[PDB]
Amino acid sequence: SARSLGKGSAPPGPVPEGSIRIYSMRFCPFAERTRLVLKAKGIRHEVININLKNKPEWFFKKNPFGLVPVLENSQGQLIYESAITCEYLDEAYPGKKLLPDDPYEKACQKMILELFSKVPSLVGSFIRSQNKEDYAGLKEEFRKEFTKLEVLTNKKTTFFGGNSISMIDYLIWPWFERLEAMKLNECVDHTPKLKLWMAAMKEDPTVSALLTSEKDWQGFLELYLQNSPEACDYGL
Amino acid sequence: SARSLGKGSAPPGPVPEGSIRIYSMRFCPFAERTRLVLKAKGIRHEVININLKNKPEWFFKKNPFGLVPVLENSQGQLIYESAITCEYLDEAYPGKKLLPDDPYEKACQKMILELFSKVPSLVGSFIRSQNKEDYAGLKEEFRKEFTKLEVLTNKKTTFFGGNSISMIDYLIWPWFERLEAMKLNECVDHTPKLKLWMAAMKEDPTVSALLTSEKDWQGFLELYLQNSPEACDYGL
Ligand SMILES: N[C@@H](CCC(=O)N[C@@H](CS)C(=O)NCC(=O)O)C(=O)O
Numbered sequence: 001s002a003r004s005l006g007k008g009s010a011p012p013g014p015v016p017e018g019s020i021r022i023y024s025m026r027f028c029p030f031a032e033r034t035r036l037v038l039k040a041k042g043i044r045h046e047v048i049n050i051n052l053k054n055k056p057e058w059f060f061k062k063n064p065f066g067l068v069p070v071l072e073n074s075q076g077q078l079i080y081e082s083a084i085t086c087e088y089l090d091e092a093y094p095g096k097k098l099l100p101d102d103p104y105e106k107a108c109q110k111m112i113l114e115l116f117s118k119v120p121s122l123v124g125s126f127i128r129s130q131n132k133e134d135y136a137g138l139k140e141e142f143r144k145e146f147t148k149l150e151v152l153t154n155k156k157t158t159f160f161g162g163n164s165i166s167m168i169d170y171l172i173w174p175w176f177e178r179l180e181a182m183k184l185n186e187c188v189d190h191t192p193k194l195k196l197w198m199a200a201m202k203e204d205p206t207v208s209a210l211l212t213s214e215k216d217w218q219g220f221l222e223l224y225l226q227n228s229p230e231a232c233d234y235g236l
Numbered sequence: 237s238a239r240s241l242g243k244g245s246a247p248p249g250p251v252p253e254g255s256i257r258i259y260s261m262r263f264c265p266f267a268e269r270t271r272l273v274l275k276a277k278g279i280r281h282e283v284i285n286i287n288l289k290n291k292p293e294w295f296f297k298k299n300p301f302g303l304v305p306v307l308e309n310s311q312g313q314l315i316y317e318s319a320i321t322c323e324y325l326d327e328a329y330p331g332k333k334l335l336p337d338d339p340y341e342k343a344c345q346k347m348i349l350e351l352f353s354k355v356p357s358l359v360g361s362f363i364r365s366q367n368k369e370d371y372a373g374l375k376e377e378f379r380k381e382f383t384k385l386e387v388l389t390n391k392k393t394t395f396f397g398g399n400s401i402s403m404i405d406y407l408i409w410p411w412f413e414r415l416e417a418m419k420l421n422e423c424v425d426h427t428p429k430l431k432l433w434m435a436a437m438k439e440d441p442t443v444s445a446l447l448t449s450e451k452d453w454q455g456f457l458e459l460y461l462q463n464s465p466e467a468c469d470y471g472l
């Protein structure tokens with residue numbers, strides 16, 4: 001019963017000792033960031049999915065912005081903005097550190113994130129565009145932005161922060177996952193490193209574990225395009 | 237000779253052992269963030285101002301975005317985006333920590349920063365607006381955003397991160413400094429805490445030390461509005 005909560009739903013009880021809770025939506029790439037970090041760190045947690053068309057009134061008490069993801073810990077603290085939530089999880093929980101100890105590498109990873117920053121909007125505006133015109137230009141935009149990542153980051157290692165997967169990879173992944181799902185892999189045909197990086201990413205056990213199937217993505221997508229409240233719950 | 241560097245200028249030499257260098261502009265509030273942190277931490281540094289109308293070609297090698305601020309350390313590393321530069325300085329240098337040790341407080345400070353995020357654009361669009369219409373609406377916008385900071389942050393202490401000044405205060409200050417300079421203090425007449433916070437901010441030795449005088453701001457502003465390359469160098 002991972003079915004989303006909507007208007008009229010009971011405000012949830014307090015997050016139990018030993019857990020953290022994520023307010024999420026199954027097809028939200030921003031929330032995927034958080035879930036990737038949760039999984040990679042082996043963090044014990046609860047998921048509550050939020051129906052984004054039919055939002056529970058109590059949800060604006062969780063995040064004044066009314067967006068997912070939001071973390072709520074067992075001390076009743078609330079954290080929103082996907083990047084903030086990922087950084088918090090890495091700092092507050094034991095195990096493999098996803099952010100490097102070194103201040104420059106940390107900074108460089110945030111600089112990479114900033115290079116990637118145009119992509120999410122391009123992806124949303126693609127899904128939500130129906131004119132032959134806007135496809136052509138959006139494609140050009142994809143090319144431009146992907147070369148930025150390819151050329152400006154000057155990756156020499158398998159992943160964006162070095163030889164092992166780390167925060168920066170998990171931060172950008174969801175939109176590359178979506179790119180594939182949208183059959184847009186050819187947008188990275190001119191960017192050899194980025195292209196290889198995608199293949200390496202899919203071999204990662206955490207990335208692998210959180211991939212959404214073609215079936216489920218398409219199911220969400222259909223209902224999303226019909227502006228249906230049931231889109232969030234596709235595939236059950 | 238803090239005169240800005242422009243097209244044709246010699247690319248600067250390597251940053252000397254024992255120093256960090258900031259690529260700046262005297263009337264840039266984003267760069268003010270960095271300079272505030274430099275001062276608060278007592279960090280030994282160089283300033284090189286960049287003429288933003290007449291940019292040195294070599295400057296895009298410092299930051300592909302061609303924006304200030306940029307840090308360059310004596311190991312030849314480059315850091316851009318004001319927030320990234322401030323966080324790096326705090327991590328990489330000794331003394332008073334401006335960010336709290338605790339992961340939640342860190343996160344909360346970033347959440348505050350996100351609440352403030354609409355303000356810089358509103359300020360720029362005010363300076364650069366000449367229609368009676370756009371003043372009225374921009375004023376409304378100011379009110380709206382300031383109540384967000386007032387109401388959503390629910391400050392109970394003198395500063396945004398507690399009883400002492402810290403990163404979050406220095407991050408948002410430049411635009412409140414600019415608000416005053418633009419004679420817009422009345423935009424915070426409905427926000428008592430924010431209003432008191434401004435007074436407390438001006439008592440801080442670092443904030444105090446970096447205030448730009450009414451004279452100099454107006455001098456920059458006049459020439460900025462004439463789209464003059466000499467705007468950066470006003471007051472000598
Ligand atoms: N900047 C936010 C964006 C989060 C976001 O946009 N989430 C979407 C779903 S992917 C949302 O909650 N939308 C509901 C709405 O917009 O009303 C983040 O990084 O977390």
Ligand SMILES: N[C@@H](CCC(=O)N[C@@H](CS)C(=O)NCC(=O)O)C(=O)O
Nearest residue numbers: 264265266288303304305317318319
């Ligand atoms: N997001 C950037 C914005 C920096 C920025 O906009 N700086 C301006 C001056 S305040 C700039 O360099 N403008 C030159 C230009 O736009 O061409 C930051 O946080 O550092």
